[PDB]
Enzyme design. Structure first.
Site, mmCIF file in Angstrom:
data_model
loop_
_atom_site.group_PDB
_atom_site.id
_atom_site.type_symbol
_atom_site.label_atom_id
_atom_site.label_comp_id
_atom_site.label_asym_id
_atom_site.label_seq_id
_atom_site.Cartn_x
_atom_site.Cartn_y
_atom_site.Cartn_z
ATOM 1 N N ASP A 127 -5.485 -6.233 10.119
ATOM 2 C CA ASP A 127 -6.769 -5.558 10.174
ATOM 3 C C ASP A 127 -7.900 -6.484 9.801
ATOM 4 O O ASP A 127 -8.983 -6.372 10.364
ATOM 5 C CB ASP A 127 -6.840 -4.271 9.330
ATOM 6 C CG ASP A 127 -6.360 -4.433 7.920
ATOM 7 O OD1 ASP A 127 -6.656 -3.514 7.133
ATOM 8 O OD2 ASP A 127 -5.650 -5.410 7.586
ATOM 9 N N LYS A 163 0.811 -1.237 0.000
ATOM 10 C CA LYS A 163 0.000 0.000 0.000
ATOM 11 C C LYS A 163 0.838 1.278 0.000
ATOM 12 O O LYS A 163 0.411 2.307 0.530
ATOM 13 C CB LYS A 163 -0.979 0.024 1.174
ATOM 14 C CG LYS A 163 -1.964 -1.157 1.138
ATOM 15 C CD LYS A 163 -2.790 -1.243 2.391
ATOM 16 C CE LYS A 163 -1.968 -1.698 3.581
ATOM 17 N NZ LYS A 163 -2.897 -2.001 4.705
HETATM 18 O O1 LIG Z 1 -5.539 -3.180 4.703
HETATM 19 C C1 LIG Z 1 -6.002 -4.292 3.943
HETATM 20 C C2 LIG Z 1 -4.798 -5.121 3.513
HETATM 21 O O2 LIG Z 1 -3.893 -4.278 2.789
HETATM 22 C C3 LIG Z 1 -2.808 -5.004 2.225
HETATM 23 O O3 LIG Z 1 -3.310 -6.015 1.366
HETATM 24 C C4 LIG Z 1 -1.968 -5.629 3.349
HETATM 25 O O4 LIG Z 1 -0.896 -6.358 2.777
HETATM 26 C C5 LIG Z 1 -2.822 -6.559 4.235
HETATM 27 O O5 LIG Z 1 -2.058 -6.968 5.359
HETATM 28 C C6 LIG Z 1 -4.057 -5.772 4.690
HETATM 29 O O6 LIG Z 1 -4.946 -6.627 5.371
#
Ligand SMILES: OC[C@H]1O[C@H](O)[C@H](O)[C@@H](O)[C@@H]1O
Ligand SMILES: CS(=O)(=O)c1ccc([C@@H](C[C@H]2CCC(=O)C2)C(=O)Nc2cnccn2)cc1Cl
Length: 446
Positions: A193, A157
């Site tokens: 999360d 991200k």
């Molecule tokens: O925030 C939603 C997701 O974002 C990205 O895919 C991260 O790698 C993952 O860990 C998280 O759950």
């Protein structure tokens, strides 16, 4: 001239048709996802697996938890959230914007910032002296050794903070807290999360054994049978596995479906070649996909008189929230007009309609792709369990799922088509990622 307006629209439709995914396409994606999930769980193929299926050390456990005050941290958007939760009331909550320099600087800076935000919060509520159990929602791929120990595999991200990858995240946090030295915290749990979201929903509804985020990023976790989690000793009960499904496709699994826009988005990202499935879905990339489609339509002289404004040609200018706003347009085009006018364009009603279609095309594809992932997980679960009909609840968070006017509906419909013999209840979590970390900490504390 309506005929020519009409001819433009027909040409747009031919271009937009590229985004379509037939049900058999989605079944293929789903199967390939399930294949990758199998590979992530197995010791023999885990290292090669694109979909990591990371054990979280969050286990099925008897009812109950410690009572009292628990601090929850939530890192994984550009906002960092601190939450005080009394076991349950969200007594207090504060959100902090992460400075540019901290997300792409050093881990020391990032965690120093986090620690500063924690002292701020503890001050706002006069409780800095109180040593509290702390749950850390940390929204990135982590290889756990335990509920409170895990190494960052890689940022996703657009996070880039140096000196974090390969290190114990809880240690980085603890280190920063110690360096500041103005409060003390007992970090008892670190969860993804998705996991936090599942836990928060599970608290309300014990049938919730899947968490999904469709926010900036896209990911899911689910309660796997311990016997299937080859990476952890023991065959009794269940453990949450963080799929990290965003990385699906990183080994070529989606190649036949990736469009030019996808390649472009990938190449301009902070993690080229990574998180490809996520790049089809996540709010970080959705608006940008639309922007690139629009530029293509402009290039074909189908939109905006073949001229793109400075703003339209600006990276990230077409915000994912605009995709949601466009698809919310009531038909008067007023919302669409205002977005495009603010982007320095002089849109016609036809231009507006075309922009609507572009948004719908990207977001529908996102919904459908996401549906194949979730269907893969749920079908997997139904198979692993003894189940003729599996009734399960999926806890969901994230601005795309929550705020997009039609993502959720398209997504649900598609998931249902791909999961006959499942009865899926969806719950939108409230405070999920924050609340979940406090709850897991209370359980981890007992
Ligand atoms: O925030 C939603 C997701 O974002 C990205 O895919 C991260 O790698 C993952 O860990 C998280 O759950
Ligand atoms: C009864 S409960 O609602 O207090 C509760 C108990 C169990 C748990 C589990 C996690 C759930 C999530 C989905 C599921 O099937 C189990 C928990 O907190 N487990 C845990 C916590 N810490 C360390 C190890 N494991 C959470 C919660 Cl809130």
């Amino acid at each position: 001239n309506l005929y020519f307006q009409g001819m433009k629209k027909e040409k747009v439709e031919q271009i937009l048709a590229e985004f379509q995914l037939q049900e058999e396409d989605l079944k293929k994606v789903m199967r390939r996802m399930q294949k990758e999930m199998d590979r992530g769980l197995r010791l023999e193929t885990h290292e090669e697996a694109s979909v990591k299926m990371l054990p979280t050390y969050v286990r099925s456990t008897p009812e109950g938890s410690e009572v009292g005050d628990f601090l929850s941290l939530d890192l994984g958007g550009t906002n960092f959230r601190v939450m005080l939760v009394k076991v349950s009331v969200k007594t207090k909550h504060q959100m902090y914007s992460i400075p540019e320099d901290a997300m792409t600087g050093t881990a020391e800076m990032l965690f120093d910032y986090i620690s500063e935000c924690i002292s701020d919060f503890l001050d706002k509520h006069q409780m800095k002296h109180k040593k509290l159990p702390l749950g850390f929602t940390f929204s990135f791929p982590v290889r756990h050794e335990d509920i409170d120990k895990g190494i960052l595999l890689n940022w996703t991200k657009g996070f880039k903070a140096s000196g974090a990858e390969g290190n114990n995240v809880v240690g980085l946090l603890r280190d920063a807290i110690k360096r500041r030295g103005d409060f003390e915290m007992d970090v008892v749990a670190m969860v993804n999360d998705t996991v936090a979201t599942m836990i928060s929903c599970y608290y309300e509804d014990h049938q919730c054994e899947v968490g999904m985020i469709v926010g900036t990023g896209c990911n899911a976790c689910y309660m796997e049978e311990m016997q299937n989690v080859e990476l952890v000793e023991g065959d009794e009960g269940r453990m949450c596995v963080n799929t990290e499904w965003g990385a699906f496709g990183d080994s070529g699994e989606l190649d036949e479906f990736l469009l030019e826009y996808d390649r472009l988005v990938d190449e301009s990202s902070a993690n080229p070649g990574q998180q490809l499935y996520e790049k089809l879905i996540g709010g970080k990339y959705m608006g940008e996909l639309v922007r690139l489609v629009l530029l293509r339509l402009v290039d074909e002289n189908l939109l905006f008189h073949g001229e793109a404004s400075e703003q339209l040609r600006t990276r990230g200018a077409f915000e994912t929230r605009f995709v949601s706003q466009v698809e919310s347009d009531t038909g008067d085009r007023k919302q669409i007009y205002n977005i495009l006018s603010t982007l320095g364009l002089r849109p016609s009603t036809t231009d507006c309609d075309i922009v609507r279609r572009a948004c719908e095309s990207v977001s529908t594809r996102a919904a459908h792709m996401c549906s194949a992932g979730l269907a893969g997980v749920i079908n997997r679960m139904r198979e692993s369990r003894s189940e003729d009909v599996m009734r399960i609840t999926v806890g969901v968070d994230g601005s795309v799922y929550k705020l997009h006017p039609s993502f959720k509906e398209r997504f649900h419909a598609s998931v249902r088509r791909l999961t006959p013999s499942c009865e899926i209840t969806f719950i939108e979590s409230e405070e999920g990622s924050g609340r979940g970390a406090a709850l897991v900490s209370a359980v981890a504390c007992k």
